[PDB]
Enzyme design. Structure first.
Site, PDB file in Angstrom:
ATOM      1  N   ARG A 183       0.861  -1.189   0.000  1.00  0.00           N
ATOM      2  CA  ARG A 183       0.000   0.000   0.000  1.00  0.00           C
ATOM      3  C   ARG A 183       0.891   1.230   0.000  1.00  0.00           C
ATOM      4  O   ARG A 183       1.935   1.231   0.662  1.00  0.00           O
ATOM      5  CB  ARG A 183      -0.909   0.027   1.229  1.00  0.00           C
ATOM      6  CG  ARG A 183      -1.930  -1.098   1.271  1.00  0.00           C
ATOM      7  CD  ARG A 183      -2.789  -1.016   2.521  1.00  0.00           C
ATOM      8  NE  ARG A 183      -3.778  -2.094   2.588  1.00  0.00           N
ATOM      9  CZ  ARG A 183      -4.609  -2.307   3.611  1.00  0.00           C
ATOM     10  NH1 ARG A 183      -4.588  -1.520   4.682  1.00  0.00           N
ATOM     11  NH2 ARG A 183      -5.468  -3.318   3.564  1.00  0.00           N
ATOM     12  N   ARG A 213       7.590   7.585  -6.472  1.00  0.00           N
ATOM     13  CA  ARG A 213       7.125   6.514  -7.261  1.00  0.00           C
ATOM     14  C   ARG A 213       8.155   5.362  -7.298  1.00  0.00           C
ATOM     15  O   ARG A 213       7.782   4.197  -7.165  1.00  0.00           O
ATOM     16  CB  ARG A 213       6.844   7.087  -8.623  1.00  0.00           C
ATOM     17  CG  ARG A 213       6.278   6.084  -9.571  1.00  0.00           C
ATOM     18  CD  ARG A 213       5.922   6.767 -10.864  1.00  0.00           C
ATOM     19  NE  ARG A 213       5.394   5.791 -11.805  1.00  0.00           N
ATOM     20  CZ  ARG A 213       4.933   6.089 -13.016  1.00  0.00           C
ATOM     21  NH1 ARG A 213       4.921   7.347 -13.453  1.00  0.00           N
ATOM     22  NH2 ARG A 213       4.476   5.119 -13.800  1.00  0.00           N
ATOM     23  N   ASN A 260      -0.437  -3.265  -8.778  1.00  0.00           N
ATOM     24  CA  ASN A 260       0.031  -1.998  -9.363  1.00  0.00           C
ATOM     25  C   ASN A 260       1.351  -1.508  -8.774  1.00  0.00           C
ATOM     26  O   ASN A 260       1.627  -1.769  -7.616  1.00  0.00           O
ATOM     27  CB  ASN A 260      -1.007  -0.891  -9.193  1.00  0.00           C
ATOM     28  CG  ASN A 260      -2.108  -0.967 -10.224  1.00  0.00           C
ATOM     29  OD1 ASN A 260      -1.851  -1.209 -11.407  1.00  0.00           O
ATOM     30  ND2 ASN A 260      -3.345  -0.737  -9.790  1.00  0.00           N
ATOM     31  N   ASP A 294      -9.275  -0.920 -18.409  1.00  0.00           N
ATOM     32  CA  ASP A 294      -9.386   0.430 -18.987  1.00  0.00           C
ATOM     33  C   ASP A 294     -10.210   0.383 -20.265  1.00  0.00           C
ATOM     34  O   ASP A 294     -11.087   1.212 -20.475  1.00  0.00           O
ATOM     35  CB  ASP A 294      -8.022   1.006 -19.320  1.00  0.00           C
ATOM     36  CG  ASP A 294      -7.192   1.331 -18.103  1.00  0.00           C
ATOM     37  OD1 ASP A 294      -7.739   1.639 -17.023  1.00  0.00           O
ATOM     38  OD2 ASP A 294      -5.965   1.293 -18.238  1.00  0.00           O
ATOM     39  N   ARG A 312     -13.877  -0.293 -19.432  1.00  0.00           N
ATOM     40  CA  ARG A 312     -14.534   0.942 -18.967  1.00  0.00           C
ATOM     41  C   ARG A 312     -14.871   1.848 -20.127  1.00  0.00           C
ATOM     42  O   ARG A 312     -15.942   2.473 -20.171  1.00  0.00           O
ATOM     43  CB  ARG A 312     -13.654   1.727 -17.991  1.00  0.00           C
ATOM     44  CG  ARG A 312     -13.509   1.070 -16.634  1.00  0.00           C
ATOM     45  CD  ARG A 312     -12.722   1.956 -15.702  1.00  0.00           C
ATOM     46  NE  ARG A 312     -12.751   1.465 -14.332  1.00  0.00           N
ATOM     47  CZ  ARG A 312     -11.695   1.056 -13.625  1.00  0.00           C
ATOM     48  NH1 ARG A 312     -10.467   1.066 -14.136  1.00  0.00           N
ATOM     49  NH2 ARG A 312     -11.881   0.640 -12.374  1.00  0.00           N
ATOM     50  N   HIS A 360      -0.945   1.562 -18.222  1.00  0.00           N
ATOM     51  CA  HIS A 360      -2.168   1.582 -17.396  1.00  0.00           C
ATOM     52  C   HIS A 360      -2.130   2.784 -16.453  1.00  0.00           C
ATOM     53  O   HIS A 360      -1.118   3.049 -15.816  1.00  0.00           O
ATOM     54  CB  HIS A 360      -2.338   0.255 -16.617  1.00  0.00           C
ATOM     55  CG  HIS A 360      -3.452   0.271 -15.607  1.00  0.00           C
ATOM     56  ND1 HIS A 360      -4.782   0.379 -15.961  1.00  0.00           N
ATOM     57  CD2 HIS A 360      -3.433   0.209 -14.251  1.00  0.00           C
ATOM     58  CE1 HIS A 360      -5.535   0.365 -14.873  1.00  0.00           C
ATOM     59  NE2 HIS A 360      -4.740   0.270 -13.819  1.00  0.00           N
ATOM     60  N   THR A 404     -11.347  -0.409  -5.475  1.00  0.00           N
ATOM     61  CA  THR A 404     -12.090  -1.061  -6.572  1.00  0.00           C
ATOM     62  C   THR A 404     -11.861  -2.564  -6.472  1.00  0.00           C
ATOM     63  O   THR A 404     -10.825  -3.015  -5.984  1.00  0.00           O
ATOM     64  CB  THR A 404     -11.700  -0.573  -8.006  1.00  0.00           C
ATOM     65  OG1 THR A 404     -10.555  -1.287  -8.487  1.00  0.00           O
ATOM     66  CG2 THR A 404     -11.395   0.916  -8.046  1.00  0.00           C
TER      67      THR A 404
HETATM   68  N1  LIG Z   1      -3.954  -3.353 -12.502  1.00  0.00           N
HETATM   69  C1  LIG Z   1      -5.226  -3.136 -12.074  1.00  0.00           C
HETATM   70  O1  LIG Z   1      -6.143  -2.926 -12.854  1.00  0.00           O
HETATM   71  C2  LIG Z   1      -5.577  -3.134 -10.610  1.00  0.00           C
HETATM   72  C3  LIG Z   1      -4.631  -3.562  -9.685  1.00  0.00           C
HETATM   73  N2  LIG Z   1      -4.858  -3.584  -8.378  1.00  0.00           N
HETATM   74  C4  LIG Z   1      -3.767  -4.074  -7.529  1.00  0.00           C
HETATM   75  O2  LIG Z   1      -4.142  -5.252  -6.799  1.00  0.00           O
HETATM   76  C5  LIG Z   1      -3.425  -5.251  -5.563  1.00  0.00           C
HETATM   77  C6  LIG Z   1      -4.358  -5.598  -4.428  1.00  0.00           C
HETATM   78  O3  LIG Z   1      -5.269  -4.525  -4.217  1.00  0.00           O
HETATM   79  P1  LIG Z   1      -6.339  -4.742  -3.041  1.00  0.00           P
HETATM   80  O4  LIG Z   1      -6.742  -6.198  -3.046  1.00  0.00           O
HETATM   81  O5  LIG Z   1      -7.406  -3.667  -3.129  1.00  0.00           O
HETATM   82  O6  LIG Z   1      -5.338  -4.465  -1.791  1.00  0.00           O
HETATM   83  P2  LIG Z   1      -5.379  -5.214  -0.355  1.00  0.00           P
HETATM   84  O7  LIG Z   1      -4.309  -4.568   0.502  1.00  0.00           O
HETATM   85  O8  LIG Z   1      -6.820  -5.194   0.117  1.00  0.00           O
HETATM   86  O9  LIG Z   1      -4.917  -6.736  -0.670  1.00  0.00           O
HETATM   87  C7  LIG Z   1      -3.588  -7.097  -1.071  1.00  0.00           C
HETATM   88  C8  LIG Z   1      -3.096  -8.335  -0.323  1.00  0.00           C
HETATM   89  O10 LIG Z   1      -1.700  -8.536  -0.582  1.00  0.00           O
HETATM   90  C9  LIG Z   1      -1.182  -9.212   0.567  1.00  0.00           C
HETATM   91  N3  LIG Z   1       0.299  -9.316   0.604  1.00  0.00           N
HETATM   92  C10 LIG Z   1       1.233  -8.375   0.869  1.00  0.00           C
HETATM   93  N4  LIG Z   1       2.485  -8.914   0.776  1.00  0.00           N
HETATM   94  C11 LIG Z   1       2.355 -10.211   0.447  1.00  0.00           C
HETATM   95  C12 LIG Z   1       3.237 -11.371   0.193  1.00  0.00           C
HETATM   96  N5  LIG Z   1       4.585 -11.280   0.272  1.00  0.00           N
HETATM   97  N6  LIG Z   1       2.633 -12.547  -0.124  1.00  0.00           N
HETATM   98  C13 LIG Z   1       1.290 -12.714  -0.217  1.00  0.00           C
HETATM   99  N7  LIG Z   1       0.439 -11.711   0.001  1.00  0.00           N
HETATM  100  C14 LIG Z   1       0.906 -10.471   0.338  1.00  0.00           C
HETATM  101  C15 LIG Z   1      -1.818  -8.498   1.750  1.00  0.00           C
HETATM  102  O11 LIG Z   1      -1.795  -9.291   2.947  1.00  0.00           O
HETATM  103  C16 LIG Z   1      -3.221  -8.249   1.204  1.00  0.00           C
HETATM  104  O12 LIG Z   1      -4.151  -9.234   1.675  1.00  0.00           O
HETATM  105  C17 LIG Z   1      -2.805  -3.883  -5.326  1.00  0.00           C
HETATM  106  O13 LIG Z   1      -1.384  -4.024  -5.268  1.00  0.00           O
HETATM  107  C18 LIG Z   1      -3.292  -3.054  -6.490  1.00  0.00           C
HETATM  108  O14 LIG Z   1      -2.229  -2.258  -6.975  1.00  0.00           O
HETATM  109  C19 LIG Z   1      -6.036  -3.183  -7.878  1.00  0.00           C
HETATM  110  C20 LIG Z   1      -7.068  -2.729  -8.694  1.00  0.00           C
HETATM  111  C21 LIG Z   1      -6.937  -2.656 -10.148  1.00  0.00           C
END
Ligand SMILES: NC(=O)C1=CN([C@@H]2O[C@H](COP(=O)(O)OP(=O)(O)OC[C@H]3O[C@@H](n4cnc5c(N)ncnc54)[C@H](O)[C@@H]3O)[C@@H](O)[C@H]2O)C=CC1
Ligand SMILES: NC(=O)C1=CN([C@@H]2O[C@H](COP(=O)(O)OP(=O)(O)OC[C@H]3O[C@@H](n4cnc5c(N)ncnc54)[C@H](O)[C@@H]3O)[C@@H](O)[C@H]2O)C=CC1
Ligand SMILES: NC(=O)C1=CN([C@@H]2O[C@H](COP(=O)(O)OP(=O)(O)OC[C@H]3O[C@@H](n4cnc5c(N)ncnc54)[C@H](O)[C@@H]3O)[C@@H](O)[C@H]2O)C=CC1
Ligand SMILES: NC(=O)C1=CN([C@@H]2O[C@H](COP(=O)(O)OP(=O)(O)OC[C@H]3O[C@@H](n4cnc5c(N)ncnc54)[C@H](O)[C@@H]3O)[C@@H](O)[C@H]2O)C=CC1
Ligand SMILES: O=C1O[C@]2(CCc3ccccc32)CC(O)=C1Sc1ccccc1Cl
Lengths: 327, 328, 324, 331
Positions: free
Chosen positions: D98, D105, D137, D165, D168, D192, D247
């Site tokens: 996060r 960046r 991301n 994208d 959408r 993206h 999202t």
């Molecule tokens: N490219 C895209 O279109 C999109 C990408 N994302 C990406 O998806 C990812 C997840 O987003 P959310 O689920 O909303 O965040 P979230 O924080 O709710 O879930 C991410 C999970 O990753 C886990 N994690 C962290 N380090 C880890 C490791 N070494 N091994 C296993 N798990 C680990 C955390 O415990 C957490 O449960 C983000 O990194 C975000 O950038 C999210 C929305 C759209």
């Protein structure tokens, strides 16, 4: 009491109009292919079949019914009497006479003079989907006889032609047909028009990359793809005796758009009066938006002079037959 | 440069080995109903069709290909040569003479299988075989004998359809969807099948317990006629349309679903039953079997009444009398 | 002429109403699980979302809308105002808090249910909010609907969990593992041992200790695991969502498609098992386009009956003191 | 004799290695929306979930498992240990760091690299022939990172890129035109996020080019302001974040659509992130979204979209920026 009454307490016998009902008219190969595809896509809550050969009709109904455990359409009915078709949202017409050109169309007129008023009597608010050939003329016949507004009379038209085109395009390019885009429009049969300018993968126009695409100068002769489309029925008929599976799938795709109000665009036969210099009441395939009230809108494809002339020629030929028909 | 090459840059051309391939052998009404049902259920990444009548085979293949836009099975092939079936997960045998005695049906179908099964095994040594050709219990034994496959990988369609018909008729009588009407028809497929009255239920409520006369001559509601109709329905459909197709296609596609997706659902299919019901011979009959990616991994031992047990035993006796004379 | 007009010739414009509209009330973890499950099963031509938190509500709507390319539901709408729910065939109530709990959820329902009835007078109501049997009764009283159109999610999920656990023990898919948990959703649910079977083979007949404290295999603990499952999941991830979503979608399927499948859901059981009060409990019900058209009269042991009756006495004790 | 043994006769004690297995790494909102969508589309015979928060992990598994009656994916497993992921056909990575406010960046990417240094070698150890789908991301950079760490050929390392994208975009186009998004065609490519490129020349319904009908399409002087469609695409996520906190559903559905093409070998075309060196004057090892043919070998082919000068300059500027970050990373 009965075992049923020992096992089940009723809260209400009160039944209701079926809400998502489809009728298929004609239980030949085409109609049954439409029926199984419709059943396997869970489009209807009730399916009715009608035909004039009573034994065949009952047997096909029963065979489908015996598959009910594996379907999600809880009521399947059939009969020679059109009362079984009442309150259909969609009625798919596959019955007709098979082949003189004017006489053939007149024979199908006389058949439709029995079928169509029956259909209208029992489902006055249905959409009509005409599959029977020649589909462009017979969609007109159905429209004339029914009195239905243009939006509710649809011909399967070039929907399958276009699917075959995209299949063939896919084989040449090594891409799934879903990602190969191309439209065959106009009169279903030998005079249909492959719109070279709209053929694309990922929005990349093939004609712009290959200016000679679809011409006599084309080194790869993509015209042959359209030749294969207009020959396909013949070739399959020569081999297995008829075509069935592909039309049943394409018809089920159309039914999906109508029954689920998707407003997807399909190349189907609609009244084109007012377009491409056409002033006669004739139906030809153009891309139409399909949904709950049938054809609500059509896409105004930009066609070349040659392409417009081809649609106009088809329209002239069709009107020439149609004015000679007796209703 | 070709249009394709201007449009598309290839990263590699490697490999291409089908992961979920299904073959249907025999493209009659039955085979093609199976094929369309399998296609519309998205069970395969490749479908191969085989038959001896080359024009018809090609036409069916082409007709299915022309609907590819509406399907999610990217490759459909066919041919008389079994090299088209290579690497199939599941091979469905719907080849044979279509009937109309039953002994002459065995005679000719055993000869056809003597040609088919070695060719199938050659190209897909690890497949599951699903036998639909009649009489399915005998021909399942035959396919097992010829193939050399272990018991778990040779499956007969058996009473799967008999049971589906039973459940449809039960649901019609009760006004309940056949999915919620449970009951099992077991044993020899067709004329001599056995309805297990004790297992008939809705919501776990035994109909036999509620209505003790159920399935007997004393039954004023004649529920015995429901099983009788499972037999009579079938012959009625043949009289009316000349053959049956849709119901068998859908039933076969349900079996293919359980196998391909490794579901371990229970189906009444035909399996090698030696060791049950006093049966000591190499006979295949329908019992409830757990179906998954290894075919029949387990079977359920149904408690049968004396009468039900005697009917299965009589079938096993008859089948073995026929089978013991077969020459391979 | 706009671009749209250049591209598209209109045949006619008049607005139609949806044929298969479903509304989900409450966009918490449960609401949205129901909504995604319903969307992925192609049950609706329109989905309406209602909630009181306006930012979150808008956000969830948009998030679903952005997935439309991948769905077959052409319109998704949301609003605090119940006018967005008009003409619904099915309305699923998941709103409310996760004596004290009942009263809080009743006052919410005093606002929700009239608004629902006002815009979709002929809908089926499917109540998921807890305690589901009591709030199904509350919905029925307030709505004035006949009882076939007021359905509680009841023991549908409890029975799904039971069949999962049975299937793990037997090495068989839950689809082929049959068994019913009836009565009051939650702690006092009743596992009907006599109906547990695979391929119509009665487990109880095969294993007479089944369901008793004498059972060396402790099948009774399978029912305890069902009762304790939500608690265990809530402990681990803070709430439950996915299983309930999938079970609600299964109910929605039977209703929307008129399947007449049998499900254990909460319905008025006055007149059964000596119960005299207006109480809702789960029994197997035939579900279709009129909601609950019929119910299965399960033959219960005297113990099983006494359990249902006790639940009915306890529920009525709470219900009689409620202020509408 | 146990009840089971009284009821069931066993022919063989199993067990085949899994044949259509998918792993989702990360059980946050995105990972779980991918998981539910994959389950409701019958793409896998075995689903594995892996994450570092063990309690939450177990709870999500159990909740899915309790819906098994309603699914056709018979084995759902989870664990912090990557041995649960063995023999996956497709491994979807949604785990990541996060952002901290004010963070550069480069710094954010580096924290994600540090996470991928643990995840990716574990994935490779237990499924060395899998396809990797990166969702975390910033996806284009993290797809590059997964590629470098895994040692996989480029066809087996795919970023979710601009799949969502574009979806959408097609949603927004369909609302404007009164047509289902399935019949509204248009492609968002490149990086993206804020620098994505809407390819106006490919926007069409039924092969009819909107740009040819309306030459001002997508320019500043367009009286219908179609460039706002792409602006809404790039600001959609931000607005949804602000509204509901994150999202999930859209990305879940988009990933399930990618998984379908791979698992069923469909060879459908998707705009996903691939290693693009040798196109558009890009001479660096960077991943950007172009239309790619997806199947059982991952990305077998890509479509060569004809771009305008400004479109090409936008991709090049993205590549330069991505490359400038990547060459600073510590592996
Ligand atoms: N490219 C895209 O279109 C999109 C990408 N994302 C990406 O998806 C990812 C997840 O987003 P959310 O689920 O909303 O965040 P979230 O924080 O709710 O879930 C991410 C999970 O990753 C886990 N994690 C962290 N380090 C880890 C490791 N070494 N091994 C296993 N798990 C680990 C955390 O415990 C957490 O449960 C983000 O990194 C975000 O950038 C999210 C929305 C759209
Ligand atoms: N426009 C298109 O895209 C396509 C249209 N078709 C049409 O579908 C039709 C059906 O062909 P098949 O099924 O192969 O023929 P078939 O010979 O297998 O069966 C046609 C059935 O229609 C029935 N029929 C004839 N007149 C009738 C009437 N007045 N009322 C009720 N039933 C009647 C016959 O009893 C017969 O069983 C063809 O005639 C053709 O016109 C076929 C393929 C593509
Ligand atoms: N057990 C069951 O529930 C059912 C079994 N069946 C059986 O399925 C079989 C086929 O039925 P239909 O499709 O109506 O028959 P059909 O006559 O319509 O076609 C059967 C196909 O088998 C082919 N065939 C013959 N020898 C072959 C060989 N050596 N290799 C490959 N193909 C060969 C024929 O050329 C023909 O296309 C029959 O034995 C029938 O009894 C049919 C329905 C239900
Ligand atoms: N019967 C069953 O099987 C199950 C029932 N549930 C129940 O579902 C209910 C909700 O659970 P969660 O979604 O986890 O809670 P949640 O707190 O995550 O969401 C509940 C939603 O209801 C909304 N709400 C409150 N008052 C409202 C009103 N007047 N109108 C519209 N919306 C309103 C809230 O703003 C919130 O968005 C609880 O009663 C819970 O016990 C949960 C799981 C299974
Ligand atoms: O319904 C069926 O169609 C059968 C009967 C004979 C025949 C000929 C051509 C195509 C199909 C069929 C094969 C079969 O085995 C069945 S099932 C059956 C047959 C006889 C008695 C009971 C049953 Cl369930």
């Amino acid at each position: 009491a009965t075992l049923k009454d020992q096992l089940i307490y009723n809260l209400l016998k009160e039944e209701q109009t079926p809400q998502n009902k489809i009728t298929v008219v004609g239980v030949g190969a085409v109609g049954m292919a439409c029926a199984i595809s419709i059943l396997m896509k869970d489009l209807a809550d009730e399916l009715a079949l009608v035909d004039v050969i009573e034994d065949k009709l009952k047997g096909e109904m029963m065979d489908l019914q015996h598959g009910s455990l594996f379907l999600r359409t809880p009521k399947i009915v059939s009969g020679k009497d059109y009362n079984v078709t009442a309150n259909s949202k969609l009625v798919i017409i596959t019955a007709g006479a098979r082949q003189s050109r004017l006489n053939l169309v007149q024979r199908n007129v006389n058949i439709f003079k029995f079928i169509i008023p029956n259909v209208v009597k029992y489902s006055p608010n249905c959409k009509l989907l005409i599959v029977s050939n020649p589909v462009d003329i017979l969609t007109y016949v159905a429209w004339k006889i029914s009195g239905f507004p243009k939006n509710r009379v649809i011909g399967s038209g070039c929907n399958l032609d276009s699917a075959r085109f995209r299949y063939l395009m896919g084989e040449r390019l090594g891409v799934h047909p879903l990602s190969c885009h191309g439209w065959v429009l106009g009169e279903h049969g030998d005079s249909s028009v492959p719109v070279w300018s709209g053929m694309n993968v990922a929005g990349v126009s093939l004609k712009t990359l290959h200016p000679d695409l679809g011409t006599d100068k084309d080194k790869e002769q993509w015209k042959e793809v359209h030749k294969q489309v207009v020959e396909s029925a013949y070739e399959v008929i020569k081999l297995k005796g008829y075509t069935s599976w592909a039309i049943g799938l394409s018809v089920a795709d159309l039914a999906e758009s109508i029954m689920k109000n998707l407003r997807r665009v399909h190349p189907v036969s609609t009244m084109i009066k007012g377009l491409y210099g056409i002033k006669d009441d004739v139906f030809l395939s153009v891309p139409c938006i399909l949904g709950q009230n049938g054809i609500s809108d059509l896409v105004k494809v930009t066609l070349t002079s040659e392409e417009e002339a081809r649609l106009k020629k088809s329209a002239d030929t069709l009107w020439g037959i149609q004015k000679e028909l007796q209703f």
